[PDB]
Amino acid sequence: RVTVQDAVEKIGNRFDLVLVAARRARQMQVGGKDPLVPEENDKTTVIALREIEEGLINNQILDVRERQEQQE
Amino acid sequence: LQLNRFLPPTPVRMLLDKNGNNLAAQVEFETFNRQLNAVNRHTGSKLVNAVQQDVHAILQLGEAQIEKS
């Protein structure tokens, strides 16, 4: 990835984008839980941004999954 | 009362398969140890603990097989 304009409108704020992407990247770095999109030698953080742009990752989704496993 | 010379905290090694059979005395820890190698983290823990309830049963065998020991 080079620019992050596509991710701005997906999470409108450009800072909540940063923290949400950091949440997903931390999940994908040591919290296992491989990315849902293929990687191209990309770091975990860029994969998080990529999936955010793909729309399949958002703060709501992360919270839903965290709550679901916290019920376990 | 110097229980050290008589009874200290003492380890007890047991090796249980699915059916709760002992293999500790058949192979020593060290020769066994070279084979082991850790594998992926929490994804692995979830994948293997998908059937973790059996462990609760295993104790009832393992205890039953090591309590006498």
- Crossing angle (nearest 10°) for helices A16-29 and A44-54: 120
Kindly state whether B41 is in contact with chain A, defined as any CB-CB distance less than 8 angstroms. yes
Distance CA(A29)–CA(A51), nearest Å, equals 15
Both structure tokens of B49: 């603990």
List, in sequence order, the alpha helices (H) in chain A: 5-10, 16-29, 44-54, 59-70
* Chain A 28-47, residues with CB within 8 Å of chain B CB atoms: 30-34
Closest by Cα among B68, B67, B65 to B16: B65
Contacts of A21 (CB under 8 A, 6+ apart): A7, A45, A48, A49, A52
Angle (CA) A63-A57-A27 rounded to 5° is 65
For residue A57, give how far its alpha carbon lies from the nearest alpha carbon of chain B (Å): 19
Cβ contacts of A31 on chain B, cutoff 8 Å = 42
Contacts of B30 (CB under 8 A, 6+ apart): none
| Residue A7: Cβ-neighbour burial (10 angstroms; 0-12, 13-18, 19+) | buried
Nearest by Cα to B68 from B20, B29, B26? B20
Cα distances (Å, whole numbers) of residue A63 to A28, A58, B24: 15, 9, 45
Would you put residue B22 in left (φ > 0), alpha (ψ -120 to 50) or beta?
beta
Contacts of B44 in chain A (CB under 8 A): 32
Resolution (A): 3.6
Within 8 A of B53 by CB-CB distance, chain A residues are none
